[PDB]
Amino acid sequence: ESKYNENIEGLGTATVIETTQNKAALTDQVALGKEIIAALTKARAALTKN
Amino acid sequence: ESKYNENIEGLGTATVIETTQNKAALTDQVALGKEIIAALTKARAALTKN
């Protein structure tokens, strides 16, 4: 949804971007999962603001 | 505050900075994390003086 977020308060959903780029950049099966860990931690972060 | 520390003595309160670079120049869990730890022990010791 564009420009429309819940209520007036600023609770924003707002999924987070990722390290590096290029969904085909890795294919190493490792060096990815670590970024998934870091990701999940960021999820904890952006979740608890709400 | 500008100067103006309680009493006079030798005392002043610490603002613990960080090495490396700006908020936009790291953007990671690993690097930022390690830096945070370093800053934490830095401030830890900085407290136990005075």
Side-chain angles (χ1 to χ4, degrees):
Chain A
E1 290 174 340
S2 61
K3 236 65 60 180
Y4 293 174
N5 311 135
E6 189 44 76
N7 209 282
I8 205 180
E9 320 168 14
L11 327 317
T13 77
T15 159
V16 86
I17 208 165
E18 213 31 71
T19 319
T20 71
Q21 34 65 91
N22 183 14
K23 45 103 60 53
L26 17 288
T27 71
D28 289 2
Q29 198 60 21
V30 77
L32 167 63
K34 178 184 301 180
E35 335 299 83
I36 314 297
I37 300 300
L40 289 186
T41 51
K42 277 210 195 66
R44 154 181 281 274
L47 179 133
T48 322
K49 296 186 57 182
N50 294 21
Chain B
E1 293 282 9
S2 169
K3 55 127 158 51
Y4 281 162
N5 314 134
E6 132 279 3
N7 199 69
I8 164 185
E9 38 198 323
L11 292 196
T13 167
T15 82
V16 175
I17 30 74
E18 230 317 291
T19 67
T20 71
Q21 23 268 355
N22 54 277
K23 36 169 287 298
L26 66 179
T27 69
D28 189 284
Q29 297 322 295
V30 181
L32 170 62
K34 295 167 53 63
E35 296 318 295
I36 295 299
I37 310 304
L40 186 52
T41 176
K42 201 167 178 296
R44 165 226 166 266
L47 224 178
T48 327
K49 62 109 48 55
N50 319 3

